[PDB]
């Protein structure tokens, strides 16, 4: 049954895209407004950061070696070992404060990940400034739709012919047809809407079942979907406000990590989850996820 740790009590701004690397048993994850890329051993408990030159949003696996990550509005390949970044490609060039948010590697290693424009004052933000990408393994960058206001938690069905997609700003996942050889989407429609209690959503991920794993900022919570049904399958509360993301982790994935965010915490809010910002796994969930997938180029 269900069980919750407070793993790395690292009291992050911004807690995000939290990526299980299997080879080291590490998490890896971001602290967006820190600038830094982080890395968490689960063996020795320790945490490696790296420090970047602008906001970072995501990171991912590059299967030829080290990491991509979204800085800014940039794609880039980061060389872990040498703790520098390359651009790859960017995006947005015409705008005055956006960036990248969420971001996740499909299952032929292209690199999705959408824009958004930046807050100016918590929760304050320019409307639909945002565009979903991608990166393709020669470096080339697809756009697939603009008019977004916060692009967030994305993932791929299991048999590859499904993409999902949140953007924030609609209380809602949608769902695209999916085409796993040339990376088009196509077909966008609603699968699930959110409760009021269940406030914004945030990042997100599939599960071995099929079923989609949303985190809720603000609604402390992590809820389970059936995407064919509409249906909330299950909620899982965590004992803090600010829920971000989620992954799966640990042997064989049988574990889900959740990211959170300290930013925007009251001095008070702050005494009554003193772990706000932290790495939280939660075990027993009975199902188990997927591996992510690693960046073609
Ligand atoms: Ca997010």
């Given at each position: 049954s269900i069980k919750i740790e407070?793993?790395?009590?690292?009291?992050?701004?911004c807690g995000e895209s939290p990526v299980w690397e299997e080879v080291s048993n590490s998490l890896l994850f971001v602290d967006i407004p820190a600038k830094k890329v982080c890395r968490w051993?689960?063996?020795?408990?320790q945490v490696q950061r790296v420090t970047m030159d602008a906001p970072v949003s995501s990171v991912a696996l590059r299967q030829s070696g080290g990491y991509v990550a979204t800085i800014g509005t940039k794609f880039c390949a980061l060389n872990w070992k040498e703790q520098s970044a390359v651009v790859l490609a960017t995006v947005?060039?015409?705008?005055?404060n956006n960036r990248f948010n969420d971001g996740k590697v499909d299952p032929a290693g292209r690199y999705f990940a959408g824009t958004m424009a930046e807050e100016?004052?918590?929760?304050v933000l320019e409307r639909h400034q945002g565009a979903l990408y991608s990166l393709f393994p020669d470096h080339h960058v697809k756009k697939?739709?603009?008019?977004?206001?916060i692009s967030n938690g994305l993932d791929w069905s299991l048999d590859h012919k499904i993409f999902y997609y949140i953007?924030?700003?609609?209380?809602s996942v949608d769902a695209f047809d999916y085409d796993?050889?040339?990376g088009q989407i196509s077909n966008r429609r609603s699968v699930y809407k959110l409760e009021k209690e269940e406030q914004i959503p945030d990042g997100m991920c599939i599960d071995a079942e099929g079923k989609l794993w949303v985190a809720c900022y603000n609604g402390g919570r992590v809820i389970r979907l059936d995407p064919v049904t509409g249906k909330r399958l299950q909620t899982v509360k965590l004992?803090?406000?600010?829920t971000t993301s989620c992954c799966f982790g640990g042997k064989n994935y049988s574990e889900m990590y959740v990211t959170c965010a300290?930013?925007?915490?009251d001095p008070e809010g702050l005494l009554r989850?003193?772990?706000?910002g932290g790495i939280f796994k939660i075990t027993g969930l009975g199902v188990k996820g997927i591996a992510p997938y690693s960046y073609a180029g």
């Open positions: 407070c793993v790395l009590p690292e009291n992050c701004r051993d689960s063996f020795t408990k947005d060039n015409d705008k005055k100016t004052a918590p929760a697939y739709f603009d008019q977004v206001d953007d924030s700003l609609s209380y796993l050889q040339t004992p803090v406000d600010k300290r930013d925007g915490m989850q003193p772990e706000a």
